[PDB]
Amino acid sequence: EFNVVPYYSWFSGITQFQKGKEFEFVEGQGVPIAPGVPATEAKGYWYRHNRRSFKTADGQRQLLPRWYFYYLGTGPHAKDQYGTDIDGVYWVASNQADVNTPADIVDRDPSSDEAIPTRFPPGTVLPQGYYIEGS
Numbered sequence: 045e046f047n048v049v050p051y052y053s054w055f056s057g058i059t060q061f062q063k064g065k066e067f068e069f070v071e072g073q074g075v076p077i078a079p080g081v082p083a084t085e086a087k088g089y090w091y092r093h094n095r096r097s098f099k100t101a102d103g104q105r106q107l108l109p110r111w112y113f114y115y116l117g118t119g120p121h122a123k124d125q126y127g128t129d130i131d132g133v134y135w136v137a138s139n140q141a142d143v144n145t146p147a148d149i150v151d152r153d154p155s156s157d158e159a160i161p162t163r164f165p166p167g168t169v170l171p172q173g174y175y176i177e178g179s
């Protein structure tokens with residue numbers, strides 16, 4: 045969880061379960077499906093939530109990262125330039141998207157909307173070592 049309120053993603057998270065496997069998508073893929081959004085707005089980034097646990101007194105490690113998707117110009121990196129090398133950020137965009145203008149899309153009031161469970165179109169190459177939440 046969090047003890048500082050996050051920007052909330054329109055979608056469910058993707059969670060690492062195998063250490064050492066990278067988070068990635070093929071260029072053009074990796075934008076989660078949202079009913080009615082045009083491919084020109086299908087642009088943004090996945091953002092890594094580092095999680096950390098507590099020591100139990102039986103010794104006991106691991107609580108891997110979970111990634112959350114944010115449309116370009118929103119989220120904790122609402123200001124950065126698409127593409128920019130930033131630890132913990134992975135940019136993705138449909139090939140119809142112009143990544144020079146922010147997506148025209150409001151954040152998600154977590155109280156007047158649940159997260160849309162994360163799906164991808166047929167053919168999307170899923171990152172091995174990750175489990176899509178809600179699936």
Ligand SMILES: CN(C)CC(=O)Nc1ccc2[nH]c(=O)c3ccccc3c2c1
Pocket residue numbers: 045046050051052053054055092093094095112159
């Ligand atoms: C290292 N952490 C401070 C980063 C952070 O927690 N990121 C974070 C950032 C994005 C998050 N997006 C969500 O949709 C969400 C939903 C339920 C609970 C948490 C989140 C959520 C959390």
